[PDB]
């Protein structure tokens with residue numbers, strides 16, 4: 384077992400029953416002119432974590448852990464895009480509309496792709512999800528149970544939306560989750576750090592958090 | 603059709619396709635000596651909202667809307683309690699241990715019941731759930747789809763745990779959700795306030811929020 388100094392108390396895992404889950408590291412969130420921009424955000428904060436996420440991905444690959452990537456995305460015919468989601472916020476350019484990187488939040492479009500610095504490789508799971516939570520309308524739980532995974536390392540964007548939603552879903556399903564604090568980011572400084580504090584409050588109610596350097600020290 | 607002044611913009615619903623969801627208003631969270639106390643919390647902040655939650659339940663009953671109550675609970679043999687949840691925080695008294703109101707977070711025990719002042723009546727749906735989210739390992743989505751429910755009014759405790767987890771799950775499943783801000787509470791006032799702000803940020807990314815007075819104004 385590997386023991387990591389973590390908040391609120393040490394986190395122990397075995398690499399062979401652990402998966403790294405990298406959430407939504409897509410141009411649609413990190414680059415100007417995609418879905419994140421369409422919602423009225425300044426997307427600039429997210430790019431800062433890309434080298435840290437790359438270092439985490441290399442750590443997981445070198446340890447022989449399962450790597451899972453998620454993409455928030457819709458079928459090109461939008462048959463998995465609820466009308467509520469399409470209308471929310473009355474956006475000028477919405478899901479499926481053509482922006483500078485193609486149709487916003489649609490599978491197969493350039494703007495929907497994972498950044499090349501963090502791209503999946505053969506042997507990794509890639510989950511397209513129509514909501515913020517990685518477990519809703521996906522086979523992620525079944526895929527992790529088939530591989531006897533018990534522990535999840537969690538990274539990606541945004542901290543208070545897809546990352547926290549996915550970690551809360553995983554906690555309910557019995558996974559032991561460690562969020563890598565400097566491998567996550569938000570459009571809002573108002574939301575990033577306090578989301579991490581909520582997740583680990585009350586003796587770890589949703590799970591654990593630590594910086595990448597503490598994980599690197601364990602492996 | 604009813605139109606409510608809300609954040610970030612007005613919320614419209616029809617009573618026939620709307621449900622009120624009251625989350626985890628249980629002695630285990632609101633009274634001293636249950637699960638909330640066992641996790642090291644001062645549980646006193648939650649009692650302040652009980653009259654507001656009771657007024658919201660009366661409003662939904664008078665409108666003839668479906669009412670859903672959730673209870674965070676486990677089977678007496680703890681077969682639906684993941685080992686992770688049993689071990690987390692290494693509490694001195696954990697899930698299934700005997701506190702002053704019986705076995706902590708277990709179905710059928712006095713401390714696991716909904717407060718009598720917020721109890722269900724005949725014709726309301728009562729969902730026992732083993733997690734913080736109301737949709738995980740429950741039939742809630744199927745029960746709402748059978749009744750053609752599209753809109754949810756949301757209340758209960760705690761704001762940053764079961765309330766936000768259930769509202770995020772509902773949003774992913776295509777529901778339009780309005781959280782009644784003064785009918786929710788947390789052990790941590792900062793986590794209450796910030797959770798409400800993040801749910802409605804970015805043009806309503808998870809849903810809407812408004813105080814009970816604005817909802818009362820829309821049905822008057």
Ligand SMILES: NC(=O)NC(=O)NC(N)=O
Pocket residue numbers: 406407412419422455515540541542544545546570804807
């Ligand atoms: N808007 C925002 O903060 N997040 C999303 O819409 N999705 C994800 N991935 O977090």
Ligand SMILES: NC(=O)NC(=O)NC(N)=O
Pocket residue numbers: 585588625626631638641674734759760761763764765789
């Ligand atoms: N501990 C805490 O804040 N909440 C819970 O454990 N469950 C609910 N219902 O929110």
